[PDB]
Design a protein around this nucleic acid. Structure first.
Ligand code: K
Ligand code: K
Ligand code: K
Ligand code: K
Ligand code: K
Ligand code: MG
Ligand code: MG
Ligand code: MG
Ligand code: MG
Ligand code: MG
Ligand code: MG
Ligand code: MG
Ligand code: MG
Ligand code: MG
Ligand code: MG
Ligand code: MG
Ligand code: MG
Ligand code: MG
Ligand code: MG
Ligand code: MG
Ligand code: MG
Ligand code: MG
Ligand code: MG
Ligand code: MG
Ligand code: MG
Ligand code: MG
Ligand code: MG
Ligand code: MG
Ligand code: MG
Ligand code: MG
Ligand code: MG
Ligand code: MG
Ligand code: MG
Ligand code: MG
Ligand code: MG
Ligand code: MG
Ligand code: MG
Ligand code: MG
Ligand code: MG
Ligand code: MG
Ligand code: MG
Ligand code: MG
Ligand code: MG
Ligand code: MG
Ligand code: MG
Ligand code: MG
Ligand code: MG
Ligand code: MG
Ligand code: MG
Ligand code: MG
Ligand code: MG
Ligand code: MG
Ligand code: MG
Ligand code: MG
Ligand code: MG
Ligand code: MG
Ligand code: MG
Ligand code: MG
Ligand code: MG
Ligand code: MG
Ligand code: MG
Ligand code: MG
Ligand code: MG
Ligand code: MG
Ligand code: MG
Ligand code: MG
Ligand code: MG
Ligand code: MG
Ligand code: MG
Ligand code: MG
Ligand code: MG
Lengths: 76, 283, 95, 46
RNA sequence: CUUGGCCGUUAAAUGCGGUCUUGCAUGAAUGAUGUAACGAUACAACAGCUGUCUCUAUGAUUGACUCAGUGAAAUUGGAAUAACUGUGCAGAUACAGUUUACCUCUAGUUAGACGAGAAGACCCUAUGCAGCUUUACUGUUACUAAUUAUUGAAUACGAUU
RNA sequence: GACAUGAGUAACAAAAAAGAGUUUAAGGUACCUAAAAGGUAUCUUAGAGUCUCGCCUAAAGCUUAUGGCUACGUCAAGUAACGGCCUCUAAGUUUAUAAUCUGAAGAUUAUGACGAUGAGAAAACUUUGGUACCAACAUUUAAAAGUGAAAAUUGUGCAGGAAGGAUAAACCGUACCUAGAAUCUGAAACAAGUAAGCUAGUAGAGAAUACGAAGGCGUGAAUGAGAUAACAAUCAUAAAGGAACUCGGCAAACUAACUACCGUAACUUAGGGAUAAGGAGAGCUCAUUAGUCUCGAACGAGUAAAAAGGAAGAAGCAUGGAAUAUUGUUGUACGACUGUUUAAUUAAAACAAAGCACUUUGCAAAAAGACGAUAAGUCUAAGUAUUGAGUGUGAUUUCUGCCCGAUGCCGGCUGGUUAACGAAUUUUC
RNA sequence: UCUUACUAUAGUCAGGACUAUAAAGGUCCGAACGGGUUAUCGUUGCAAAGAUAUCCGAAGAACUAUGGUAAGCGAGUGAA
RNA sequence: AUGUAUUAAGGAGAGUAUAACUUAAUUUAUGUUUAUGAUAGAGGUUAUCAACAUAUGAACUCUUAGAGAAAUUACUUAAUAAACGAAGUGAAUUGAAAUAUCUUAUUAACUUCAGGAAAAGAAAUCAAACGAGAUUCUAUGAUUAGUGUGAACGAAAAUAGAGCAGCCUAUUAAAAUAAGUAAAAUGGCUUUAAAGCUGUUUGAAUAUUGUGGGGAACCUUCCUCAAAGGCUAAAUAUAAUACAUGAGUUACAGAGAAAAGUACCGUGAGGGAAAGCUUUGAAAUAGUAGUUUU
């Protein structure tokens, strides 16, 4: 069983609660099964990986900027 | 069976201290001692044991007819191998047919009144020493059970039977208890011939404070050492009694002869009351 | 002793006999030796039919526009027991 | 002054002393729950 | 009263020890008295030992000081906030008089600002409190005594007269 | 509530400690280059690592708890190499049942149920009461030896030492942190505090003392670099003197540990005092060897064997060489003594104490004492006058005198008094 | 869940010495552990009770852990 | 805040189309009117371009079988907060310028029982020589009569209004008309000494052909009512919801809460925030500039 972090109902506001836990099961197969390897970043264009990577980078910078502010600091 | 729980610390069923100066002693077990002795027949003494629950010693006796083992208060001098018998349920046919008559106080007392034998007080002659005296006809032994204690038979309600043979007419017999009180005891009351064992119990000395703690006794704080809010004797600068007559923490006079027996509860079995020393120095 | 103590106690927070299941269901009984005997009358099985040759899918083409059923003059249109019985006599009368 | 009275504290005692069952099964505990329920508390116990 | 007298200890004894006692105001289980053993108890002495001192000196590290980075607090009516004498709600940076002083900081220091903090401490007041005490006032109990009722009889004796 | 002052001041000092290279990502500058890009160097932010040095070390290490505002891919039929759940019960709990008591609430006894900090078959395959018991202490025992556990054996002392039941694999826990370097409690990233096991080696009687293999660390810039004044803290040494200091030897110094060494007073409750006091010895090399061990072949040799050993010897200022163990003696008061106390200004002469003494308690239904809006009832106690309770004193030696007037308590008259009750009386409308 | 007492179940106490014992002692020296004698520092402290040294007990009236009981008209607990 | 109407068990946990709410978390149908409504197209996720009315599928866990450390176990078509009501028990602060009687106060609070309301109720009632005619709520009567040393406490008749209902054959199923009762002494409560409540010990009568109770010490005549047996709606209390009104509030106001009993503090009972919008930008305070002085 995988437990979930205790959180506030509305993120930064509300009572403290805990979501339902997650359960993972590992079965021992009689016949092996192998997963394919994830496509290369150059072949993920069917998923619009280019646009998705730009948006992801912007979200990472936004959370990094917030972390710097959460430390009581600013970017010179 | 084990003696455990908060009762060992002086607490009652509410959890509050009702008996002061108790707790922290050694782990003990209670010994089931037979103070009635109703089963007839000979009983073979197997050994004399030490009992932490009483001052006197106990004897592990075995019923030769049944094989069941029991505990009884041992008498002074009683050792292993001895044979004790209880004549409370009645005299055996072997003793009756021999004498022929129903009862012969003469030869009866010479064949039953031995050390460690349990007999009805009526069957014990005057001037004999006994240490498990009962009170009621069908009750257990209650008097003189402690170490080195014994009662004396003073008189018996009886008359003679035309041949110098005394026969019981009344329902009671008079006995002198350890405290010196001569009171009235039933005719069929329990009584064991002899003296309670461990006569030298009251000569022991503990030697140190820790030995009293092992025996479940905790420190006793004097009233003078307390404050006025805690004791009638508390208060005062320095050592001070406060011109206060000695009393308990609840106002009960602790000296002067104040009797704590309830006045309405009059003792109807007393023939000669105890002798009050009246605060005089004995030695 | 602060904010974390005020959260609901979970099995991952303490030991010493705090057992709390996840509503999986009793599949047997406990023994006096500390083991578990499974009762297969309580164990559940999943009845999945044979899907070979099944032409239905969870989607319907959007060329077939959605339409609801009509039961004029019938308040309990689709829940009418008479329509179920009358429709039974004509279609299947045997069973 | 204040003292560190929660040092070595266990959560088995919290449930026994302040838990929900400690209150619904007693006469005075029911009052506590009913008082906190009237005030609108989410945390009725522990 | 008093550092009581005397003796020992000190170069010097209001101390300590011994001793005599007319002890303001010792005293026998609110125990009296004397040893062994024990004591982070209190007092006194000796030997040794030492920077405790004569009388301090040098050395070491960390702070203190400077540069860079981060960045508090008590406090604060407002201030252009000197000395003396006098004055005055009676102890003056601020009033009178006279004197003295270019403007502004840094490190030290604590004489004053009746410095700061704590209604901290004392005394007094209140027809204000709290706990405790008792032969304070007024009361409640433990407990004791008599008696209707539950509860019906017999006999004798004694005392009233 | 906002914003000033102190003030850009204090602080970022657990007496562990740092130095010099290397490298990744993203971004900011300068140059090369003007075809963007790329390259070289540097800086900022967030990391990683190498060599050296130091600190901790019966920890500041490893493995795990209590716990957790650290984080959720932490995986078990059982044993080896696991706990919970489940069975059983202790202390206790009980808005369960019955009976009883009770102004209501409730309380009591019994039974039941619940309740671990305890007990639970087998496995490197598995499913009666000393004829005793498994508290303490000691002893013995898995046969090459030693050591540490487990369990058992035997014994000792008094303080006399549980209960109950039995005997084809679900569900829950499993991550990380353990307080000197980012996590628990202390309002917090606090020099405090917190459970269990392991915790190299040398050297020792040792978990003492010193070093420290592995490991970790030498804090999130919550700091770094300089300089080395006064003064403070923590230390080091010291001429001559040695308490002249001071309320007072406060602080500091002297002393110290070890040996199967010598010797040791007054006094004494005969046990002590006493490790009294005061002295001697110690490391390195070596002659020598009864046995044990080793090698060679009774004997010979050997400490590249453990030990023994002497009035032997060498060197140095010095061989208890560094670290670790804080003086000796004497006269008094108080308290016998070991203990206990104002958590966080008084540790004592106060409290307790063994001992001693007095009062009380006869147990026939309630022994007394204590508790019970108040009872049933509980402790006392499965005790019985050598028992229990209360009170004072405070081991032991030597002793404990006079007064019963006052106060308290106890006992006592065919007494006086005597409320209720009541013979005999009396009044208003 | 601090603390005082009690209660149940458990755990811990290097090594050495004396004493009648192999084991019988509120014995001795001394770590762990538990105390808090004295001094200094600190006093908007590292700390609303800490640091350093020194000192005391350390097989017992010992220390410790997990639970349980007893407290607020009457006073629970109290080596006071 | 008040008023009006309606209603008469409340919360939490976790999950989910983040207006949509219960693992079905946006179910499926009927009727009418649809711009003269109500108050001749496009659009099924590029969705819900329709309101009203009547039905309908689904609706988890805990509180809430037992047990337990609520949201677990183990079972199963197991299930009811507060406030308000009645009775029982019953303080103290306070005032009297102290303080005991008194007052505070038939108060707060606690316990038991009960319903949507409960309680009370159709005269053994009041009046006064005339008469009224159950109960409940509000006002007046009334800082009155009266009590108390004082301080203070404090009715009833009657009047007005809200509601109005009488009965035993109770519109739900009850009486053969009430004896240990009325009443007395005594100890208390209430209180004006009566009446009313009550522990202990005692203890009546039978109807206007004047039997019994009351008419404020008490007796008497008269009047009045008929205890010891019962039923009864409304006006009243409380909570929730909706609506109406405002010389009520407009964000340190209003409420504690414009996202709240949340965050946070506390072992716990318990205590308990801040926080609106796109407008305006006062003072204090800080760094500069201009003029001027130093
Ligand atoms: K009751
Ligand atoms: K006298
Ligand atoms: K006398
Ligand atoms: K006398
Ligand atoms: K009357
Ligand atoms: Mg006692
Ligand atoms: Mg005593
Ligand atoms: Mg004492
Ligand atoms: Mg005192
Ligand atoms: Mg008193
Ligand atoms: Mg005195
Ligand atoms: Mg965890
Ligand atoms: Mg944990
Ligand atoms: Mg369990
Ligand atoms: Mg406190
Ligand atoms: Mg604790
Ligand atoms: Mg005396
Ligand atoms: Mg700076
Ligand atoms: Mg002047
Ligand atoms: Mg001027
Ligand atoms: Mg100054
Ligand atoms: Mg200074
Ligand atoms: Mg300054
Ligand atoms: Mg400075
Ligand atoms: Mg500085
Ligand atoms: Mg770059
Ligand atoms: Mg398992
Ligand atoms: Mg059980
Ligand atoms: Mg366990
Ligand atoms: Mg540490
Ligand atoms: Mg912390
Ligand atoms: Mg720390
Ligand atoms: Mg060490
Ligand atoms: Mg570490
Ligand atoms: Mg570094
Ligand atoms: Mg010198
Ligand atoms: Mg010298
Ligand atoms: Mg001098
Ligand atoms: Mg001098
Ligand atoms: Mg010193
Ligand atoms: Mg020589
Ligand atoms: Mg030489
Ligand atoms: Mg002492
Ligand atoms: Mg001591
Ligand atoms: Mg103190
Ligand atoms: Mg202490
Ligand atoms: Mg102290
Ligand atoms: Mg004595
Ligand atoms: Mg009794
Ligand atoms: Mg004394
Ligand atoms: Mg004395
Ligand atoms: Mg009379
Ligand atoms: Mg505790
Ligand atoms: Mg010792
Ligand atoms: Mg200072
Ligand atoms: Mg000692
Ligand atoms: Mg020691
Ligand atoms: Mg339930
Ligand atoms: Mg359930
Ligand atoms: Mg007055
Ligand atoms: Mg008047
Ligand atoms: Mg009638
Ligand atoms: Mg009456
Ligand atoms: Mg009356
Ligand atoms: Mg009447
Ligand atoms: Mg009248
Ligand atoms: Mg009637
Ligand atoms: Mg507001
Ligand atoms: Mg505004
Ligand atoms: Mg405003
Ligand atoms: Mg402005």
């Amino acid at each position: 069983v995988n437990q979930r972090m205790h959180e506030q109902r509305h993120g930064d506001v509300g009572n403290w609660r805990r979501p339902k836990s997650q359960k993972m099961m590992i079965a021992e197969l009689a016949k092996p099964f192998v997963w394919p390897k994830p496509p290369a970043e150059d072949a993920r264009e069917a998923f619009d990986y280019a646009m998705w990577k730009k948006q992801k980078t912007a979200q990472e910078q936004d959370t990094k900027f917030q972390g710097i502010r959460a430390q009581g600091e600013v970017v010179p | 069976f084990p003696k455990k729980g908060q009762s060992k610390g002086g607490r009652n069923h509410s959890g509050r201290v009702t008996v002061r100066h108790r707790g922290g002693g050694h782990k003990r077990r209670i010994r089931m001692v037979d103070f009635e002795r109703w089963i007839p027949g000979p009983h073979t003494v197997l050994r004399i044991e030490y009992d932490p629950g009483r001052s006197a010693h106990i004897a592990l006796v075995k019923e030769e007819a049944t094989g069941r083992k029991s505990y009884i208060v041992a008498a002074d001098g009683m050792r292993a191998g001895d044979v004790v018998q209880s004549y409370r349920s009645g005299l055996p046919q072997d003793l009756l047919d021999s004498m022929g008559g129903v009862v012969d106080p003469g030869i009866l007392a010479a064949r039953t009144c031995w050390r460690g034998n349990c007999l009805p007080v009526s069957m014990i002659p005057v001037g004999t020493q006994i240490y498990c005296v009962g009170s009621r006809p069908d009750g257990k032994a209650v008097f003189c059970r402690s170490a080195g204690t014994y009662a004396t038979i003073i008189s018996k309600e009886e008359e003679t039977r035309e041949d110098g043979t005394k026969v019981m007419t009344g329902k009671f017999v008079n006995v002198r208890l350890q405290s010196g009180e001569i009171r009235r005891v039933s005719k069929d009351a329990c009584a064991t011939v002899g003296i309670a064992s461990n006569i030298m119990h009251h000569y022991r000395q503990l030697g140190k404070a820790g030995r009293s703690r092992w025996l479940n006794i905790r420190p006793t704080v004097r009233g003078l050492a307390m404050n006025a809010n805690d004791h009638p004797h508390g208060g005062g600068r320095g050592k001070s009694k406060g011109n206060r007559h000695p009393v308990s923490p609840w106002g009960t006079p602790a000296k002067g002869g104040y009797k704590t027996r309830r006045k309405s509860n009059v003792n109807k079995w007393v023939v000669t009351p105890r002798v009050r020393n009246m605060g005089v120095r004995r030695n | 002793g602060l904010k974390y103590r005020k959260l609901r106690l979970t099995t991952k927070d303490v030991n010493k006999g705090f057992y709390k299941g996840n509503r999986t269901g009793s599949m047997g009984t406990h023994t006096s030796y500390g083991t578990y005997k499974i009762d297969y009358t309580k164990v559940r099985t999943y009845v999945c039919p044979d899907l070979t040759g099944f032409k239905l899918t969870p989607f319907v083409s959007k060329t077939i526009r959605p339409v609801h059923d009509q039961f004029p003059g019938d308040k309990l249109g689709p829940k009418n027991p008479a329509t179920y019985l009358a429709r039974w006599k004509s279609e299947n009368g045997l069973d | 002054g204040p003292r560190p009275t929660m040092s070595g504290a266990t959560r088995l005692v919290q449930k026994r002393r302040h838990g929900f069952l400690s209150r619904v099964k007693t006469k005075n505990g029911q009052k506590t729950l009913k008082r906190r329920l009237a005030k609108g508390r989410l945390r009725l116990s522990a």
